């Protein structure tokens, strides 16, 4: 890979973006910042993964650097992002993955240390938002701070694009049945801002608010105000599913929907939007790099204008690979 | 607390209908048939329950009878339902809970042994179907074989009744996020007729078919052909949730929906349809006897005619208590 | 008449000690300190519990106080325990349940605010340690700061006392198969001090170190240096089990072990050490208030001097009730 | 010159023995019998696996045969094993994996249809039993029906061999914390012979009896009568762990035990007995083909003669690979 990348935060998104970068070879990770995880612990956290298995390659600590597949990575331990010397480490792009510096003002602190561009691996209240395969062609070299939206927006937007382009979405309501995440608790504990999210993750189906369907309206401006939804967190370690109930303007028989989604999966959205007619379940998408995989057998139509469409997503690996693809696309435009 | 009842099958539904009968005191269990579970094992299965806790009372085997709280229950071990001597044991109504004698022809075999009425604790292809609080007033003494529909139909129908009575449901699509059931497998195993249902229940979100939303059109005839849906089985031991996405005829602001559902929960549907504004999760409904509990905070409206309504249900205890309530209602009409 | 109690920390132990105090009525909770959980959130966390169900009585926020069953409780939000005004609230005993002030020096900070005695609801490196039914008669009025040991020590010590008193333990090695706890992570995350404990709790069996078996040697001085062990954390929300493999001095047939444990459970250790011959599983002990329940059917003897003994414990409810029992015992000695 | 194999049963062991056979290339599967799983369903069950992921080769149904990586496999659907035409399909060795024909009389039914040898992939009450790396050199050409013991015996026997050879095991007691299996139930259900095994697998820690430690005494005659144990089934989909508490004749410092086990893992037991000092958890052994992996950091010594040794095993893939290794060894002796 050609662009040199720095990763802020070695949490689940930071580690899996690093794993995707080395597995795909599309970008070169040269620096990682994390003030709470030391070098020897980073080796362990990167090498072993309960969900995705052992890293396929070599990882070791050598001379104060994390060396992955022979590539040395400078390690920083700064709490203040404006103090990270990204430029001295050669990091041109920075993936801001901590989840706490998501505004352009906060993510822009990485420019002080010499980074040229910042990619927020989460929704942002004000940064331009992108979804690969949907609006990445709207990216240009003047944008120094951008967001790759969320894993759920990356699942819904490619499907919504195909459905809207062929039949027109009059309105839609989404539910995502989502795997557990790092912000949840093992047993009933404090969450403060989101009380239901503090309840034991192993024991419960937990309703949760999500701006993912509304965010599709920013990535596909014609759907602004036409979509909203919510989520249920369930006790699975990984892989989630979107359930889009929509009204269509043009009549669409279910076989016509299958035809256009299959055609999009084989052409312009290949590798982004998948298509299957197999009797799949969530574990079949573990470590799958697609953003969205349409499940033809799981959906149901009430009539030609009112349908429920189902799409699977590995909420960890699909999204992490899209962060890398977005950076590779950005690098090709330099 | 008067009608004498026989229970065919000591599976999950049979045992919890028996527990609901002794806890509510509305009906008297006098006989149980199960050809595969012997008396000493019935004591154990009834006394200890992983989901609902130990039985609060006494359970013993004495002189070939199952004795619960000092009440002796005759135990039969017949494979052929037409050979069960219900009349001789004093059982007036029989709960057909095995899941394999759901047609009126098959469930009618209990009349040969002297039962007066049969309540199929499952959907039936041809028996009259009832949901307490929705169409139980249509029951008449002439009906000897009836069905109490499924746990999911009992959750959706009370909510759909209130919404349709106040705003009119033009069309709706339902998703149920359902707890695991006895027909699922611990690890990937054979299912044959439903391939996805054989996949490991602890590891997967599994899409599944349900006739529950279509069945609401039989208990609420005005909704015939206007509702359908599907399910996702998730790894929780009990408690499920319905997500109804519907198009309304009259405009309904979300606060107007909350007001009419709250009013119904405090009046004609008290004890059947619940209402909450608390930050609840699924475990909060464990052993809850309501058929449906509207979650005001979890639902979302796109506009005044297109909304997503959420309702919780203890798929084991709500349904089992409704079987007892249906029999008590039937007894009051004799 | 009842001692007035303050609880420092409204985490899992703090809330369940508060619940055990109201359920048993043995002590009066008058104050709670927690700098991270505000009053409205305390109402929610106390009222709903995924593991133990909804609180039986009433819970509400009124005039800045937490009102449980009509009893108002003063709420403090201090990070420094020496600044908590326990005396202004009338709190005589303080339960130090945060897990971070476990030395006599740190727990003693509560005496500055007017508390008379402090009970550390966790192991302490230097405070006198007690296990109800084993050494609580060694408590005296001169001890202002004491520890109630851990949930695991309270399970092992009553059983080890009976076995050692009757047959003599030459040596023993313990394994506890433990339910998940609040210190674990939902998905692979940072733990720093204990790397295995950061691994996803829902996906893994995790080995862990524990000083519980060694601590039994401090509560039963004759067993000092004769016991040690380790733990496996497994994905269950609650209820744990001890597996004690010990070498006995006097020969003990397995029926002789059952006889002495049953006799102890019916006499001096009634309510502390339970005994069962039923085919129990972990969920059968959910919300069980015993410290230890000997499982006669699960254990196995290789010979008369080498046996494996099994004992269940609700790691949340047994221990929380023992904290209340220890305070009631202390109050009776004033 | 590879042996042609028939597999009776396409359950968990049958499918993973087939997968190990194609992955290792040590034998050629030419036939599979299963009366309950038809050809199209076998394609699906083999292709998708919740635990071990998708089969990365090719699988399809063609002309009534199951074709894996271009190799056609004859499919039989016989309930009676004496009616399976193994000889017509060219199957020389038959893996009897149903768990229902484990005596030499029942497993010998495969000789009627033309098989030359039968390998029971489970313990047998009377067939000669083997563990690769421990007693496979005792196999000879006169043995037509043999057993590969259980996954647990294959974990304990290699470790017990090394410990006994170097220090002498005076006596030992084993506990296995075992992942869930196909014989368990998703929710509390019937298991007439083993009541605890019917209890909900997702909710419980379930004690269970196992003859695995006693079976080590048949494979290592010098340990006959010196070992026994029990199991706890816990809610993990795969990977189990053995906890051997043993008294040693020669003094053994824990570092001496580590040295001896590490040396065995690098020499005569390479690929059978693993050794690690890493901070591993169960998911780190998912799809690991070792029979046993000694966890140096998890074990604990009370003194030089009384220790607790921990060893991990992928109860599905380690055992399935040993069945293939045993057949490859048998074939080399023809």
UniProtKB/Swiss-Prot annotation, chains A, B, C, D:
Source superkingdom: Eukaryota
CC per GO annotation: cytoplasm; cytosol; extracellular exosome; GAIT complex; intracellular membrane-bounded organelle; lipid droplet; membrane; microtubule cytoskeleton
EC number(s) on file: 1.2.1.12, 2.6.99.-
Positions bearing the site annotation: Activates thiol group during catalysis: 178
Region (Interaction with WARS1): 1-147
Transmembrane segments: none
Modified residues (S-nitrosocysteine): 151, 246
Gene Ontology molecular function terms on file: aspartic-type endopeptidase inhibitor activity; disordered domain specific binding; glyceraldehyde-3-phosphate dehydrogenase (NAD+) (phosphorylating) activity; identical protein binding; microtubule binding; NAD binding; NADP binding; peptidyl-cysteine S-nitrosylase activity
N6-malonyllysine, modified sites: 193, 214
Domains as described in the record: The [IL]-x-C-x-x-[DE] motif is a proposed target motif for cysteine S-nitrosylation mediated by the iNOS-S100A8/A9 transnitrosylase complex.
The protein's name in its UniProt record: Glyceraldehyde-3-phosphate dehydrogenase
